[PDB]
Amino acid sequence: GLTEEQRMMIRELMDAQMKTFDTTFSHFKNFRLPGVAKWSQVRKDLCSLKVSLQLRGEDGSVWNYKPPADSGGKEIFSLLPHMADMSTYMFKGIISFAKVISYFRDLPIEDQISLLKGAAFELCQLRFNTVFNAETGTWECGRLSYCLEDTAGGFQQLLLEPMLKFHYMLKKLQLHEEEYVLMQAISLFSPDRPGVLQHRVVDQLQEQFAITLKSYIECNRPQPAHRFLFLKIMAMLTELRSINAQHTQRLLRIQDIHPFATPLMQELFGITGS
Ligand SMILES: O=S(=O)(c1ccccc1)N(Cc1ccc(Oc2ccccc2)cc1)c1ccc(C(O)(C(F)(F)F)C(F)(F)F)cc1
């Protein structure tokens, strides 16, 4: 079954998640909002986001934003300031998650920074899948809601952008909170990240989290639908890392044309300021 050590690993991760995941986004406030040539062509990477924004007030008021269509203009950058603020809020939560976990704290500062930089996007996306509604194509973030706008091919066309397909595929697995936090742990403690000194310790931690995840699934999911779940999750994690490397390249190209990264995002991506 589950060993007490395995049950102590899950509890440590689960408590770290509860303390640092504001699932209602109640402290996300004071954020920016959109106002009331091969480089540029590629930089039209932005069209795959296609998101509408809803902001519900406590008074009952609802503000709704619909994005501009591309007209060969700067209007494509209208939502980047808001998204940078949301990304920064999510990343701060992820940093707090790592810092409250005993195993991460024990690691050297240099390794802690290297691991956070490598896994920050992946951990944020894993948390965002918990708030994603597959039926509505919407990410429900407290009073903010982010809805995918209609596209010609509809669902299938959205499933062509890897980030979106990841979200739909992961949600279909119908994971428990314990399985999400183990995926975060496996992704955070990745030994093959640039700059990791204590690779052997990190690799052993990762294997223990994966063993714990495999054991959790074996003990709590006996149904033929959950056959090969551990391996599906591990493949998902491998795809997320490829998505992460692609997203980094897309982001840095936009930044090069149209700077928008916040200070914390600049630190994450090694932008110096000079
Ligand atoms: O993948 S989503 O859900 C998404 C959102 C909208 C349309 C399609 C897909 N996402 C949310 C998200 C937020 C944070 C994150 O982790 C990061 C951690 C540190 C630094 C950067 C990211 C990962 C996903 C999303 C949000 C923004 C972006 C951007 O590339 C954008 F803005 F240039 F499109 C940018 F620049 F803001 F990061 C991409 C995906």
Side-chain angles (χ1 to χ4, degrees), residues 46 49 51 79-80 83-84 86-88 90-91 120-125 128 139 146 148 161 163-164 167 247 251 254 260 265 268-269:
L46 290 154
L49 78 83
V51 83
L79 267 169
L80 277 177
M83 298 303 317
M86 174 57 99
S87 296
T88 298
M90 293 286 308
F91 184 27
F121 173 87
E122 312 175 17
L123 265 79
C124 290
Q125 283 271 81
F128 263 117
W139 289 270
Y146 298 83
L148 292 163
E161 165 57 47
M163 284 197 308
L164 272 76
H167 274 289
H247 169 266
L251 185 141
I254 300 160
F260 74 102
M265 294 171 49
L268 195 275
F269 290 101

Side-chain angles (χ1 to χ4, degrees), residues 167-171 173-179:
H167 274 289
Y168 279 103
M169 284 171 83
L170 189 55
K171 200 75 188 193
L173 300 183
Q174 298 195 278
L175 298 182
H176 304 161
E177 303 279 9
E178 293 83 347
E179 281 145 353

Side-chain angles (χ1 to χ4, degrees), residues 13 17 97 119 122-123 125-127 129-130 166 169-171 173 175-190 193 206 209-210 212-213 217 229-230 232-238 240:
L13 294 178
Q17 182 89 315
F97 171 76
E122 312 175 17
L123 265 79
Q125 283 271 81
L126 292 169
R127 277 193 179 183
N129 196 253
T130 73
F166 171 83
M169 284 171 83
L170 189 55
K171 200 75 188 193
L173 300 183
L175 298 182
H176 304 161
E177 303 279 9
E178 293 83 347
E179 281 145 353
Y180 274 105
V181 79
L182 284 157
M183 296 182 60
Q184 286 169 203
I186 293 158
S187 166
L188 173 62
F189 296 98
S190 296
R193 302 263 199 227
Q206 195 184 234
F209 288 125
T212 302
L213 176 58
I217 287 151
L229 190 48
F230 174 69
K232 284 192 233 204
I233 286 163
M234 296 312 293
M236 286 312 268
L237 286 182
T238 303
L240 192 48

